[PDB]
Amino acid sequence: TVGIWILGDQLTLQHPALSSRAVDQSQTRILLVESLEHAQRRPYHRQKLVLLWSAMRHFADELRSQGWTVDYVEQADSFQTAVSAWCQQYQIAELQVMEPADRSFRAIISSLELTSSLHWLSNCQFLWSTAEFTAWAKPYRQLRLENFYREGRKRWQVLLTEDQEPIGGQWNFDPENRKPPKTGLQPPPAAHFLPDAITQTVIETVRSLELPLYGKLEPFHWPVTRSQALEALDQFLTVKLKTFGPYQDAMVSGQATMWHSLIAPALNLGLLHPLEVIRQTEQAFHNNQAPIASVEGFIRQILGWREYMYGLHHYFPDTYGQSNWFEHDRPLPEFFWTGQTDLHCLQQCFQQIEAIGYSHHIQRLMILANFALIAGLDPWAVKEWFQATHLDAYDWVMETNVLGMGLFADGGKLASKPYAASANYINRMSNYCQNCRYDPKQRLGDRACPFNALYWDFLDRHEQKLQAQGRMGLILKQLQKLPDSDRAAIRDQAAHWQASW
Numbered sequence: 001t002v003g004i005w006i007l008g009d010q011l012t013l014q015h016p017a018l019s020s021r022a023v024d025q026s027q028t029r030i031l032l033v034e035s036l037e038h039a040q041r042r043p044y045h046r047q048k049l050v051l052l053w054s055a056m057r058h059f060a061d062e063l064r065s066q067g068w069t070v071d072y073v074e075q076a077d078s079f080q081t082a083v084s085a086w087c088q089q090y091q092i093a094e095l096q097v098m099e100p101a102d103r104s105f106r107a108i109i110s111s112l113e114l115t116s117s118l119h120w121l122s123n124c125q126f127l128w129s130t131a132e133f134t135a136w137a138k139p140y141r142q143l144r145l146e147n148f149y150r151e152g153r154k155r156w157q158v159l160l161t162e163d164q165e166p167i168g169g170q171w172n173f174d175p176e177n178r179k180p181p182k183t184g185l186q187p188p189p190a191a192h193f194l195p196d197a198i199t200q201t202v203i204e205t206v207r208s209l210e211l212p213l214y215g216k217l218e219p220f221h222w223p224v225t226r227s228q229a230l231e232a233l234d235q236f237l238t239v240k241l242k243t244f245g246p247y248q249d250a251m252v253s254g255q256a257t258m259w260h261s262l263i264a265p266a267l268n269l270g271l272l273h274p275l276e277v278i279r280q281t282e283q284a285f286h287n288n289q290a291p292i293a294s295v296e297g298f299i300r301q302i303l304g305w306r307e308y309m310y311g312l313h314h315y316f317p318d319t320y321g322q323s324n325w326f327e328h329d330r331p332l333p334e335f336f337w338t339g340q341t342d343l344h345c346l347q348q349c350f351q352q353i354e355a356i357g358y359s360h361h362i363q364r365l366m367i368l369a370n371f372a373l374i375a376g377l378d379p380w381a382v383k384e385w386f387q388a389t390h391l392d393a394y395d396w397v398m399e400t401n402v403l404g405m406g407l408f409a410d411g412g413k414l415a416s417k418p419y420a421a422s423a424n425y426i427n428r429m430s431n432y433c434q435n436c437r438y439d440p441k442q443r444l445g446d447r448a449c450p451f452n453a454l455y456w457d458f459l460d461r462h463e464q465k466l467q468a469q470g471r472m473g474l475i476l477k478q479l480q481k482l483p484d485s486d487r488a489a490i491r492d493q494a495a496h497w498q499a500s501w
């Protein structure tokens with residue numbers, strides 16, 4: 001008998017084993033396993049475990065409804081235990097497994113001691129294959145997102161005219177997609193879904209776990225099935241896509257979701273495929289649902305950024321997780337876990353992450369990662385915290401986004417420059433500072449925004465290495481205007497916030 005073991009982020013009906021064994025349906029058995037040892041590796045958001053395990057159970061029933069014999073092992077101790085016993089029990093001869101998106105997971109699988117032999121199949125959940133990405137990247141020492149993205153537009157024939165020119169007269173509309181927030185404008189609402197019976201049962205199961213976990217269990221409103229995921233997507237496309245562009249980087253107090261799609265957790269489980277998402281987004285444009293700038297804007301986040309991160313996770317060395325270019329080693333402040341800070345920008349983020357396991361991109365980069373970079377925090381710790389707390393989190397996307405984009409911990413392999421910034425950025429692109437007890441225009445004293453002393457001490461401390469990269473000339477000239485007495489005072493100020501967190 002052939003076995004297929006399907007993993008919790010591979011919930012796709014186009015799993016390759018399901019396409020090849022489709023003639024051999026009566027001689028195949030499908031396994032899915034929930035592993036408590038796996039969940040114990042991080043203090044996971046309660047909604048992450050709810051989401052993943054409810055999506056798994058729903059997917060298993062979907063597969064049965066199509067004729068497949070599916071054995072589901074609930075709340076197992078270990079993959080070793082569950083998988084070995086199932087293999088033994090059903091005399092499985094060949095265990096087909098799709099290459100995990102998270103490369104560290106491969107070691108787990110291939111270390112299992114099993115009566116079956118292992119037959120690896122290629123991951124075909126993303127647009128670019130690992131081999132294709134590697135071939136594209138190999139010729140260059142320095143990679144660039146923009147070029148990769150254009151190559152994507154061509155290979156998948158995305159938003160092109162009949163003569164192969166980019167629709168709207170240019171490849172990239174991002175310059176237009178950085179307006180600050182407009183006073184009084186109310187975002188449209190997030191898609192919400194009431195848990196069904198399966199989901200409810202998992203909520204109860206998570207509720208009673210003894211593992212240390214994070215954040216609120218309820219209300220859980222996330223899509224857990226393909227059909228809900230498609231609904232979420234369709235609603236984003238018909239309501240929000242029309243203004244995704246303008247306020248892409250905007251942050252507003254009290255507004256957790258804004259004009260974002262919130263499909264990443266569903267995409268990252270396999271319930272949606274990146275191409276389908278892109279094709280629907282184009283169709284939306286050809287149905288007059290949104291301007292091209294927002295249309296292209298959205299697509300670039302999947303065709304570009306998302307593909308890029310998956311590719312780099314497998315292209316980079318497997319030691320990339322230890323990148324620490326700045327030699328930062330400070331522990332996270334407890335406020336990352338409790339949310340108890342009076343830095344309003346941070347508090348707002350932590351509040352929504354606690355409540356729904358989600359912050360939007362510009363929060364992740366310009367509030368959270370930015371803070372972690374200028375505060376000198378251990379990159380591994382930050383990365384782990386993001387991985388525990390966000391419902392779209394996996395190694396492939398979090399190693400790259402945190403260590404590459406947010407923290408420049410790889411020294412600029414992924415990004416052009418550090419995204420570090422003082423309160424000038426946050427006050428301009430948000431309304432958070434208005435409701436804050438700190439002043440974004442002060443640098444010293446008890447009422448100064450701590451971002452200011454930290455950013456300027458950050459520059460001072462790494463002045464030499466930043467100088468040698470040579471993309472921060474203008475910013476470093478600013479540092480260079482500060483006398484040694486002024487930078488001493490900034491350092492004392494930074495030292496004070498660090499001790500007071």
Ligand SMILES: *N1=C2C(=O)[N]C(=O)N=C2N([C][C]([O])[C]([O])[C]([O])[C]OP([O])(=O)OP([O])(=O)O[C][C]2O[C](N3[C]=NC4=C3N=[C]N=C4[N])[C]([O])[C]2[O])C2=[C]C([C])=C([C])[C]=C21
Pocket residue numbers: 259260261262263264265267268298301302305306307309359360361362364365369386390392393394397398401402405406
């Ligand atoms: N950590 C994560 C993570 O765990 N999972 C994840 O999918 N993405 C992370 N990012 C990148 C983005 O911040 C994140 O995808 C968005 O916040 C997800 O929310 P939403 O509302 O689904 O996103 P959207 O509508 O604005 O965008 C549409 C889709 O585009 C993809 N996308 C966009 N930008 C991306 C990306 N995928 C990978 N990488 C990047 N940079 C999504 O699939 C989305 O559905 C992340 C970024 C940063 C800066 C940190 C520090 C940590 C994480």
Ligand SMILES: O=c1nc2n(C[C@@H](O)[C@H](O)[C@@H](O)CO)c3cc(O)ccc3cc-2c(=O)[nH]1
Pocket residue numbers: 006007008009010033034035036038039044048049052100101102103105393394
């Ligand atoms: O097959 C499973 N996959 C689970 N996954 C996802 C797997 O696909 C695996 O973590 C990936 O590393 C493989 O790409 C989880 C991911 C999390 O972030 C948190 C908890 C889980 C739990 C499971 C699980 O119980 N079973």
Ligand code: SF4
Pocket residue numbers: 342343344345346423426427432433434436437438439440449450451
């Ligand atoms: S003042 Fe500083 S801490 Fe307070 S909100 Fe603005 S940036 Fe965030």
